[PDB]
């Protein structure tokens, strides 16, 4: 026989998007940003939760959307799909 199992346990997104040198691993966490942005795109678009929360989320939008930039990027420089070069111009 052989060992072989997975799906323990939910992994941990990092943070630096050199630390992950798997293309097949960037490829997930590009997608997994973007559907946070959107969650809170919501929140922003209702406009009836209060400044004090509007504030809160358009704060972590941007902070979303940086993580975006290295990785659909990152997976590029990594020999996988272009997601960050074809949004918006040159840059690097």
């Known amino acids: 026989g ?3 199992s997975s799906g323990k346990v939910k992994e941990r997104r990092p943070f630096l998007a050199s630390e992950c040198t798997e293309l097949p691993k960037a490829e997930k966490w590009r997608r997994q940003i973007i559907g946070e942005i959107s969650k809170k795109v919501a929140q922003i678009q209702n406009a009836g939760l209060g400044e004090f929360r ?3 989320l358009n704060d972590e939008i941007n902070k979303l959307l940086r993580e975006k ?3 659909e990027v990152r997976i590029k420089e990594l020999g996988g799909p272009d997601y960050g070069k074809v949004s918006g111009p040159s840059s690097g």
């Open 54 to 56: 509007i504030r809160d």
């Open 69 to 71: 930039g290295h990785w």
């Open 2 to 4: 052989s060992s072989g």
